Design a protein around this nucleic acid. Structure first.
Lengths: 77, 103, 44, 91, 60
RNA sequence: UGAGAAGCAUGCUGGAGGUAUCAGAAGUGCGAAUGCUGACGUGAGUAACGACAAAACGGGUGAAAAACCCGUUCGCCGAAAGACCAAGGGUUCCAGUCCAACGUUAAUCGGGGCUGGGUGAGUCGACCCCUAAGGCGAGGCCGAAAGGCGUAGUCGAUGGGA
RNA sequence: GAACCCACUGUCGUUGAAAAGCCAGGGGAUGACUUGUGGAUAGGGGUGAAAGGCUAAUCAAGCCUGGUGAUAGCUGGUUCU
RNA sequence: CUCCGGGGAGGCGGCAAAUAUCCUUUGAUCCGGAGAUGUCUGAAUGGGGGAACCCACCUACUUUAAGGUAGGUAUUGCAACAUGAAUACAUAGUGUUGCAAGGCGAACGAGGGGAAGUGAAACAUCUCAGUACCCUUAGGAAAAGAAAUCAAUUGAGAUUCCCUCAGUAGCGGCGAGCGAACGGGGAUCAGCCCAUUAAGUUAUGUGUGUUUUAGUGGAACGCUCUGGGAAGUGCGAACGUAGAGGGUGAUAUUCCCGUACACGAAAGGGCACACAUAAUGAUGACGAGUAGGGCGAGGCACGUGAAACCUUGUCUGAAUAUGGGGGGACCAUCCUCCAAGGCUAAAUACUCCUGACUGACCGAUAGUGAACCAGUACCGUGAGGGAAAGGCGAAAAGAACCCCU
């Protein structure tokens, strides 16, 4: 499913609103994609499915911290 | 206020009120008394056992509330109570308190 | 003339049978509805 | 082949014209047996309980009839029969 | 008869079990043949087997 | 008896409940809605009795015989109106006994009611070993959830194997 | 030109023997052939040598149950003095 | 079937009589409690499969022929242990042991998705309506909850439910319609913690109280008339802490079962209180990719409106107590509060069920579809649809025997 491993973002629902104010169901999707990160402490590449906000959090906190946090929630990475 | 299988009772209601006899059987709320409440059965002859039928006479059951225990001392109807004498529960006459005379 | 019902026991059991109903979620709801109504026969 | 099972194997004899003819002419005994009994079980039960020697066993199953008694419909049970051939002249 | 069986030991009980089973089969065959007037002995044996089994379970 | 919706008395039937007065509440009044359920009329003892292959007589039984049984004649099918298998049905199979209902008539007859019998395998078929189309599918990939697809496998005869 | 598969004409039948048939004639009959068993495609979808044909005697949008006692400026009916 | 307790003359369940055989005062049938047994299918879990069937393996014992008994053999998640590639360390993978889960069920709760018929006398904004329906998942309740909340005499003091405020202020093709809050009166009342860790809660065992699962005793009426039968007529009595109800050949406080009242438990369960032993609360130590902002949407009674406040799909992005949030555009001043970490009873919602009682509720075309062998017969490939059918008599005393056929 389209779920980010770092933030938990997922598609949401909303409306298309026309100029005549007709309303139609739509979805908003995350900016999801796969990326490989070098885990030094284990000497290996780890593949994650995440958003660009997830990348910003990784740049802010470091990859090993995020990996430990994810393993703390029972994720197999 | 039970009535048992060998008691001497007197009929207090019905077509045979005023007569007495010996209890023959007690089942549910119906009682059979010897020599009272006779009916005529038209028994059809039985093929398998022979014993050709006929008109026979036999007793019919009455409602248990229509008979009363007979007190031998006074020859009157009476009610029945219970009393614990020694360690045994016993049936007694309510009118006088004497233990019921077993026959 | 040829009529609509041409019986075959194997086809009957494979389309409407107990294990066929149990295999899907909607079939399990069918069985639940018939148990609730009290049918004496759950399946063909 | 436990003794309990051996005692449950056989149910009773069959009384009929065919069974009587087979018994009188060909040394064949007809038995009613348990619906799950096997030929080997029937053979061992007969050998143990009647003290004879069995040549071969033949079995058949007849489905029970469905009859309407009163306003209700009922079905009888299935019955299994055993044709047991005895060696030479026995029983 | 239950106290009579309860006084007994395990070996005697397991012997009586087989004897009662043989007797039950004999009774069934006799009734099926049709040389039996009283059928209450069938019920007596049938209940005796159950009593012996209950006592065996209790003792072991 | 009263102006009316109605009231009062009493004979017969019936066999255990009914209820003044004044208040109170309403599932409170039926001829129609091609209204709803049951019963019964008219048509009327009228149409019809389901392939135009076809019947006749003697004897029997029986309350009763055009239709059942036995016999002597006549006619019809014969690439099916004969004999088998699969599928489907499930006791309709055989014997004794009965004729209310069922049988487009009667019935002593019956695929009808009741009672009792009857299906015997190493070699026939199934089960079993093997696989087709296709199904399911450990991990897996994808998807708001339910779920979709699919690898290794595992099922699946209409086919191969004493 | 038989079996088999079709359905061109006519009489009959139309509360039928039959909710599509019988009879007399008719077309194909080694092929783009007929047929058994088991599978696949599901409703604004399927399939169609194409007629809006077929999709369980139902098709210009199948059937069942729910929303549901839809709405009807329309028709009918509306009970003692 | 067994043990314990109750009870004291009959009994062998019903349709369904009778027969026959039996059991029982050496304690039967029956009633209550605790055990024993408990085939096959079904989450079905050894593999498979057209549910109630087909085919297996392993171990211990046993049999002598081609077997029997007992146990084990599913998947996934977690923990430990063993083993183990590309690849040297490793890791992936593989296996064993232990623990846990899956399914079913009325309503109520929380969350993820989400219509149209209809109204507007047409219809697209709007309404219907976050309704119907689908999906996931708790508990006896759930959710919420201890102010970065309201108010505006500088006052109140967590959450939830009811009455008012009020059809008011507002929103709205300013149409049809939608519709608050402040304040006041009630129900119930409670606060406690962030690494040495609190209130509380859940299990275990013990000790007290209460209740529950059989039961026992339980008063007092006679004459007379009518009558098939008296409980009804006439006359005269008795009990009452009992004149509730049901039955008895017609209408009974004194005929029967009962009723007021009094008494009762081998054994077992529920609730409450106190204590003890675990666990949990509790990976959490004052809250940064956070508050705020641009773009697109959703929620607020509030439809972009002068539109504050809350949530976020996308792009960004602070200060950090000399600090920060709110008071319905925005600024200044005043007042008030401390977000980016948690736990918490009651007042509230419901009835598949069990016991007692009640009705200006129905009385067989009514009341449940179903008073009766009913979700049955019957209809349909299937999902599904879905009936009709109560009454002899107080007691079978249910018509011996004769006659027509």
């Amino acid at each position: 499913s389209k779920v980010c491993q770092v933030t938990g973002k997922r598609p949401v629902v909303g409306n298309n609103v026309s100029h005549a104010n007709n309303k139609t169901k739509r979805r908003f999707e995350p900016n999801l994609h796969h990326h490989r990160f070098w885990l030094e402490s284990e000497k290996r590449f780890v593949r994650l499915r995440l958003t660009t906000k997830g990348m910003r959090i990784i740049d802010k906190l470091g990859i090993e911290k995020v990996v430990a946090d994810l393993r703390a929630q029972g994720q197999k990475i | 206020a039970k009535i048992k299988k060998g008691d001497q009772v007197i009929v207090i209601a019905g077509k045979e009120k005023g007569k007495q006899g010996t209890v023959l059987s007690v089942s549910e709320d119906r009682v059979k008394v010897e020599g009272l409440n006779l009916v005529k059965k038209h028994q059809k002859p039985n093929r398998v056992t022979g014993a050709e039928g006929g008109i026979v006479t036999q007793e019919a059951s009455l409602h248990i509330s229509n008979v009363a225990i007979l007190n031998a001392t006074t020859q009157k109807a009476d009610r029945v109570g219970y009393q614990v004498i020694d360690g045994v529960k016993t049936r007694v006459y309510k009118s006088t308190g004497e233990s019921v005379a077993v026959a | 003339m040829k009529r609509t019902f041409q019986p075959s026991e194997l086809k009957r059991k494979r389309v409407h049978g107990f294990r066929a109903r149990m295999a899907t979620k909607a079939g399990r709801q069918v069985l639940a509805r018939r148990r609730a109504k009290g049918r004496h026969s759950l399946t063909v | 082949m436990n003794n309990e099972r051996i005692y449950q194997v056989l149910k009773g004899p069959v009384f009929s014209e065919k069974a009587q003819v087979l018994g009188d002419t060909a040394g064949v005994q007809v038995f009613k047996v348990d619906i799950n009994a096997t030929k080997l079980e029937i053979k061992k039960a007969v050998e143990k309980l009647f003290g004879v020697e069995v040549v071969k066993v033949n079995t058949t199953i007849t489905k029970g009839k469905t009859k309407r008694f009163g306003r209700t419909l009922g079905r009888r049970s299935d019955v299994k029969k055993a044709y047991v051939t005895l060696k030479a002249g026995q029983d | 008869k239950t106290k009579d069986l309860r006084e007994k030991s395990v070996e005697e009980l397991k012997a009586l079990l087989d004897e009662q089973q043989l007797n039950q089969f004999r009774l069934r065959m006799a009734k099926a043949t049709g040389q039996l007037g009283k059928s209450h002995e069938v019920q007596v044996a049938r209940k005796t087997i159950a009593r012996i089994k209950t006592l065996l379970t209790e003792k072991q």
